[PDB]
Design a protein around this motif. Sequence first.
Motif, PDB file in Angstrom:
ATOM      1  N   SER D 917       0.812  -1.209   0.000  1.00  0.00           N
ATOM      2  CA  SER D 917       0.000   0.000   0.000  1.00  0.00           C
ATOM      3  C   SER D 917       0.848   1.263   0.000  1.00  0.00           C
ATOM      4  N   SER D 918       0.299   2.333  -0.569  1.00  0.00           N
ATOM      5  CA  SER D 918       0.882   3.654  -0.402  1.00  0.00           C
ATOM      6  C   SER D 918       0.528   4.204   0.978  1.00  0.00           C
ATOM      7  N   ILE D 919       1.447   4.983   1.551  1.00  0.00           N
ATOM      8  CA  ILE D 919       1.326   5.509   2.908  1.00  0.00           C
ATOM      9  C   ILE D 919       1.453   7.026   2.865  1.00  0.00           C
ATOM     10  N   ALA D 970      10.904  -0.580  -0.108  1.00  0.00           N
ATOM     11  CA  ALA D 970       9.755   0.051  -0.721  1.00  0.00           C
ATOM     12  C   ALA D 970      10.173   1.351  -1.399  1.00  0.00           C
ATOM     13  N   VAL D 971       9.299   1.844  -2.269  1.00  0.00           N
ATOM     14  CA  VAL D 971       9.599   3.022  -3.070  1.00  0.00           C
ATOM     15  C   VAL D 971       9.228   4.238  -2.230  1.00  0.00           C
ATOM     16  N   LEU D 972      10.212   4.799  -1.539  1.00  0.00           N
ATOM     17  CA  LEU D 972      10.002   5.983  -0.721  1.00  0.00           C
ATOM     18  C   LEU D 972      10.207   7.232  -1.563  1.00  0.00           C
ATOM     19  N   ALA D 973       9.853   8.377  -0.983  1.00  0.00           N
ATOM     20  CA  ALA D 973      10.102   9.660  -1.625  1.00  0.00           C
ATOM     21  C   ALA D 973      10.984  10.587  -0.803  1.00  0.00           C
ATOM     22  N   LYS D 974      11.135  10.336   0.494  1.00  0.00           N
ATOM     23  CA  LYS D 974      11.834  11.253   1.382  1.00  0.00           C
ATOM     24  C   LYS D 974      12.943  10.513   2.119  1.00  0.00           C
ATOM     25  N   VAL D 986       4.106   9.603   0.749  1.00  0.00           N
ATOM     26  CA  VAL D 986       5.548   9.406   0.644  1.00  0.00           C
ATOM     27  C   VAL D 986       5.920   7.926   0.514  1.00  0.00           C
ATOM     28  N   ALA D 987       5.520   7.078   1.464  1.00  0.00           N
ATOM     29  CA  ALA D 987       5.877   5.658   1.408  1.00  0.00           C
ATOM     30  C   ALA D 987       4.887   4.947   0.498  1.00  0.00           C
ATOM     31  N   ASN D 988       5.219   4.915  -0.784  1.00  0.00           N
ATOM     32  CA  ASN D 988       4.317   4.475  -1.838  1.00  0.00           C
ATOM     33  C   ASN D 988       4.810   3.131  -2.349  1.00  0.00           C
ATOM     34  N   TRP D 989       4.081   2.061  -2.059  1.00  0.00           N
ATOM     35  CA  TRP D 989       4.549   0.765  -2.510  1.00  0.00           C
ATOM     36  C   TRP D 989       3.383  -0.100  -2.955  1.00  0.00           C
ATOM     37  N   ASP D 990       3.683  -0.986  -3.876  1.00  0.00           N
ATOM     38  CA  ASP D 990       2.739  -1.914  -4.458  1.00  0.00           C
ATOM     39  C   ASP D 990       2.517  -3.082  -3.497  1.00  0.00           C
ATOM     40  N   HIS D 992       2.819  -6.013  -4.467  1.00  0.00           N
ATOM     41  CA  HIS D 992       3.609  -7.098  -5.029  1.00  0.00           C
ATOM     42  C   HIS D 992       5.105  -6.837  -5.039  1.00  0.00           C
ATOM     43  N   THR D 993       5.566  -5.692  -4.545  1.00  0.00           N
ATOM     44  CA  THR D 993       6.995  -5.410  -4.566  1.00  0.00           C
ATOM     45  C   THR D 993       7.699  -6.087  -3.398  1.00  0.00           C
ATOM     46  N   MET D 994       8.557  -7.055  -3.721  1.00  0.00           N
ATOM     47  CA  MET D 994       9.554  -7.604  -2.801  1.00  0.00           C
ATOM     48  C   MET D 994      10.872  -7.548  -3.560  1.00  0.00           C
ATOM     49  N   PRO D 995      11.550  -6.409  -3.552  1.00  0.00           N
ATOM     50  CA  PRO D 995      12.635  -6.182  -4.505  1.00  0.00           C
ATOM     51  C   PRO D 995      13.910  -6.936  -4.154  1.00  0.00           C
TER      52      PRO D 995
END
Lengths: 79, 49, 50, 1335, 99, 50
Positions: D917-919, D970-974, D986-990, D992-995
Amino acid sequence: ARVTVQDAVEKIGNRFDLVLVAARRARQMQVGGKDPLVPEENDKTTVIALREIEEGLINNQILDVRERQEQQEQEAAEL
Amino acid sequence: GQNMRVAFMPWNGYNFEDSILVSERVVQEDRFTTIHIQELACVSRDTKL
Amino acid sequence: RDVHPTHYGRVCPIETPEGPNIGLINSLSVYAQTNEYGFLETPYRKVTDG
Amino acid sequence: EEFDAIKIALASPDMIRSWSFGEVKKPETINYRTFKPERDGLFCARIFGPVKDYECLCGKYKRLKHRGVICEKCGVEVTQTKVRRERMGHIELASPTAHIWFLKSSRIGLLLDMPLRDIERVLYFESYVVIEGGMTNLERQQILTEEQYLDALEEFGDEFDAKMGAEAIQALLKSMDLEQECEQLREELNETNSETKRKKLTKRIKLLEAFVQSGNKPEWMILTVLPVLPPDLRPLVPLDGGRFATSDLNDLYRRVINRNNRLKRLLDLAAPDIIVRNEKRMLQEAVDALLDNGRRGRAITGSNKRPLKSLADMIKGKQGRFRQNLLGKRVDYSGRSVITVGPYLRLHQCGLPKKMALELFKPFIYGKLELRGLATTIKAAKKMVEREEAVVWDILDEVIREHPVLLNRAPTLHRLGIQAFEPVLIEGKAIQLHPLVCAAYNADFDGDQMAVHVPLTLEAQLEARALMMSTNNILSPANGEPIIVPSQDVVLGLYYMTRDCVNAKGEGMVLTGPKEAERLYRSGLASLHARVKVRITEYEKDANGELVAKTSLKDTTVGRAILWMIVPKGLPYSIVNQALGKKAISKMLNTCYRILGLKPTVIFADQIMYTGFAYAARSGASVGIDDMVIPEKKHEIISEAEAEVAEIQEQFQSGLVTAGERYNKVIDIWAAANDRVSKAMMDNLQTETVINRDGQEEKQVSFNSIYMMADSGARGSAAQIRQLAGMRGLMAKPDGSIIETPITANFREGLNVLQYFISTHGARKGLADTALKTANSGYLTRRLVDVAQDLVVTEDDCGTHEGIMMTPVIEGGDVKEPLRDRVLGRVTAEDVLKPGTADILVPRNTLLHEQWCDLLEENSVDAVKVRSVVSCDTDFGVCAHCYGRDLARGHIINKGEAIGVIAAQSIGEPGTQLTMSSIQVKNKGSIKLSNVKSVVNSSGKLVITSRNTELKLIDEFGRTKESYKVPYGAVLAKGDGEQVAGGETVANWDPHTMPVITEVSGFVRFTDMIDGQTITRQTDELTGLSSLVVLDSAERTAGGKDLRPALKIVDAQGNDVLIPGTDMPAQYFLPGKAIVQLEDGVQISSGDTLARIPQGLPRVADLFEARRPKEPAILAEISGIVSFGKETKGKRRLVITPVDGSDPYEEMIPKWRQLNVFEGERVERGDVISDGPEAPHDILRLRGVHAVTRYIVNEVQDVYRLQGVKINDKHIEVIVRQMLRKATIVNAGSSDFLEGEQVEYSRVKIANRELEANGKVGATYSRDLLGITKASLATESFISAASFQETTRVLTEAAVAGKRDELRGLKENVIVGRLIPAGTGYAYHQDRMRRRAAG
Amino acid sequence: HARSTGSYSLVTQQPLGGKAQFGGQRFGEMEVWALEAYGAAYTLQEMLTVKSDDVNGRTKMYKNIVDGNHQMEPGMPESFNVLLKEIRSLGINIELEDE
Amino acid sequence: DIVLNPLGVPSRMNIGQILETHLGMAAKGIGDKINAMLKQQQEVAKLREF
């Protein structure tokens, strides 16, 4: 007194010794034949004792002096 | 049963928590009078005496 | 101790003692009779085209 | 007669003949004509004593001429007949037969190294056993058939030993040696301590030693004597019409005497053994049913087909003496009748009828007919009270004045379920109660009745005066709340009294006093709710404990002024400038306790009840059918709803979408249709009066009655105002799945015939749960008492070190648990300090009263170490300075109370309510992170490479305000060090992402990873830019399953590029499910990815039970990187290989569960290796003891805080402390190697081995973690374990171990009837703690 | 329904129950747990000795209130020694370690 | 005659007793308009219309 026991456990500091200082005290008028020190107010002795405590004249220690001096007026009285 | 002229309002804490307050008239009209019939018995048997 | 939708028209779904006999003690409905085998039935009004 | 402890052990064969009074030699009971006992049966007067006092069978010695001689002419003694309660009988058995409680439990196979099934064939006369083999052709203890019995007999003649039967098992128990066979197991215990071969020594080293120390013999498991219960304890008495009545022990004794008689008659008559065998097995049946009937064989019954009540049945169950007879009893001097409302009362007063107290207070009434001289005798006094004579009332009327009394309602579900009262005698037939004790009792005036009880002795009046009086209890023992909160009638009438209607009469006129305010309304010259300009004269204690007063001009309404003629001289006006709903009231009476004290609030409670009743009746808020209004646009939502489900239903006919998505869109629409209906009525209910008063139209709160209850918090709620106005949500058919169509009419519009059938689903389902799981919560409360039994606070303070650390439980989202209501009343563990450091108020300990929660409010310190009663170290009782405030009183708690039997009532009494989820950043705060390893990516954003970092938004103050978790990469922004405003994602993740992100930039080529062996090549056809995709381990080749994929991102020369700043290689041994993005030759930057991995009440019970959950995630043991072992053998392996420590650990884990740290990757002690729940048995072991307490005080809290039912968190702490009162000893010096012992006992053991007598020969220990139906039976007191459950397990496991009691627990004196050693009876008992040491 | 002294049950020597039996109220086990938390002792003592089971104790308690002397001399409950003799009739030596 | 508690209608959801009250108000009231024409004793002519 008649309704609460707060103003006497402000003196005694415990919810059980105020029973226990008066468990000792309130037999002396049932079968001990004595009279209280406060105005009686037609009261049953489980609060007459509670009156004597919360009028500041009774803690556990001051009961223990009138029970000592009673015995030294029977000890040499025999001899 | 009978039928009672009823009126929904609190009354000085007399009908507090789903309590009922009946008036003195509906006693005297004998509206809730129930005849309960007891049944007692006396028995006499033999003994050893 | 449930209310099956197949109790329609045969079993009263607001009659049980509310203690620990809530799912066993039951009444029968008004128009119900019993089958010649001994099963629970209900009359109906048959539709012939409208 | 004065006795101290209670010992249990086995009885010797000789001791019972020192108990009894002779022999029973016959099966007779009584003479059938002359209903007198026979001789030498189960009733004889010679053995057990007389039938009439001082009269024998002939009648020689009567009427106490001769007191204590025996009548020779029948054999019958001349004494009391109460001795028939005492005298036991004894029978010799023809052959010694085995005891059943040391067979079926096992104590006799385990004692002899034989199976319980392989014993029975030797008992049942089927197979011989070797008694003493002098010849070793047959080893001892061998099951020899009758066929081979002839074979060895001819070989050895009489040089061997072999018998069969239950006297042969006496011979087996006779042969061996206790100390010699203990020598060998003590020797070879240290050979190979295997886990499948530890306890068969560790039990047997206990039991073989226990025979020596407790003075017990291996022969006493057999019975050669059967003791007989005395006949008054098994009385066969006459009923009325010639019919008699017997207990179940009469006939079960008859089936043993006759079998002990027929076996006697067989031996002399030279019987065949096949007759003598079958006689012996009938006695084996007959003994067993006498002790424990339904244990082993087919149940011997009477003629009424129920099993006969055995002796163990007289101990076990709800019909055993330990529960039905010695903890709960009948009691005289007591009555009951139906309760009803007494409105007029005062608080300490109960309404007792005149026609009742004549029979409770009868010997009190008899006390002052003889002392007054108004009755010469008692029979003169007995037929006066029965004549209801004149003075009888006015002697009783003197007595009941100043005489306390009890009133009890079952189920008395907490400590306030039995409160003292003082009577004020009415004339009637039912009991009138005070209106502010109903909420304390859970009383609806619908037919319940309460029990009354008489405090006979002098202390009982004193204890009823001082301890439990209804004025002594105002507050909760669970939390700070008062239990004197006004419920429904007055809380309307207060809200009607204080209100603000803009129009009535006299708007804004002048007044001079609240007296003359009541000159006005009582005259009809004003109204209640209409604003004016007044004067009040308030007070303050802002002097030095002194009443300081002032006086101003105010602005208020008239009805608000009249209420101010009640409050006792301590408050501002700022409580009554309102409408006075419910939560507007509960802060008034809470404040006057926190300002004035009890005896003010005893009047203040009785005085609002005298006006909220008299006003609501005066106003009157009836409820007509037009007060229930209908929303106007209610139909037009339903027509729109049948327009919105119109295109949904016709679309599935086309097939554009399945029913699996169609359903939730129908769940969407009918909800969101109703969410327009359920809003619509709330326009024209809360402001539907648009009144006009020298103006056009003015709007306010409406005067509709069903709203005013809801606006006061009296009855109803938002979801309950629906079903009298609009459609009532959805109602589910009881399978679990829910229908698509709501009930579009409320009750005022009438339900449909079919919908009311659907409505009846929730009727039983609610009622077949709330009347079923009441039992499922009652059994919860009982074990909560049991593990908290023997704890009694028995010190003032030992004063140990600091303890557990508080931090608010704001977690996940909003500010859920403020620290003010967690540190309240608590003792500060250490000296605490401001954001200004070295600014300390407290010399390591103080009472945090109502100002210090406001002190730590101002200063932004928000993390407090506090003292909790698990962090005390004193045994058999705790220090008060780890507990906190006496919640029932409001001071620091005294010395002597029991808090465990408080805390067990703080949990079960809410237990009968709670079955059913995005946060983004939300606000302006900072950003802080802890336990951080992260990396700047190619974009300039962040990806988090740590399992253990959380996103925290600190404000301008310095305390925490929010918290969110983040996964690996996870795909952060800050980043960190920032203070960024809320409202951004900011904490925006799918999902299904386990990178497979790397931290270090390099060059990606293909290396060591071929297709066909560990990979199926899935080249992505639509875009080309996939790679050799790592799948899971369960779909590749077994010839390539010996290794894993391992991608080596290279530098120029070809090496794995290291982590910058360490000399260690970091290339990715790829885990499963990894689709690699780009092929050979490519690069990834820093932070950029190699591959991608796409993907109530019994919960309350299991925590206090420590139920190990079904899918346990595994957790580590020590720091260090990981090696691996066997691949795909049922379950896989993981090898612990530390940084410097030795590396022996290897665990059967699965690869079938996903991982957290990689294979060449390091992990730490106490972290996680997988995903899922956990057993706390690990979380005590691997992580320290100050986390499993913070687990359970918080993990169970998400049930009770969910419904918002508040319990102060000292109550979880007291009873998790009892679940940890054991240890697993490792070293030696006093104990076994790896046995179990109380840590409170072994801390007395390390109290001396490290004290100056010894340097250190002590033993080291871990901590054990039990449930609550284990930690009670794993306690030293054997009576409590017999008092609770599983006594057939208990009384055998307590007998051979010589287990005494000490009379310490709060059951341990009840069963003997002694005084409790708590509170009133504690100081008496500490004299007995020393009067043995002083004498 | 009320009771001062009605007839006692036969075996355990405790009072009966039910109004039509002229029995008494049942102070159960769940009604003990509130009194322990109160810390009251004598009320929880004298609801077992003089009220409930001690044969000698209720006799003196009758003579305690006739003459006026509010006093409670307890003793042994006459159902506890019942439980002692019942285990003794199971052949396991439970006993009393006196002083 | 009986003064019940109107604070047991909304949250307890027995609501047709308010409607049992209102139709119960009508039927006894017409019992009194008929008892007008039985004590005043006018005729049965206007009764048969009524």
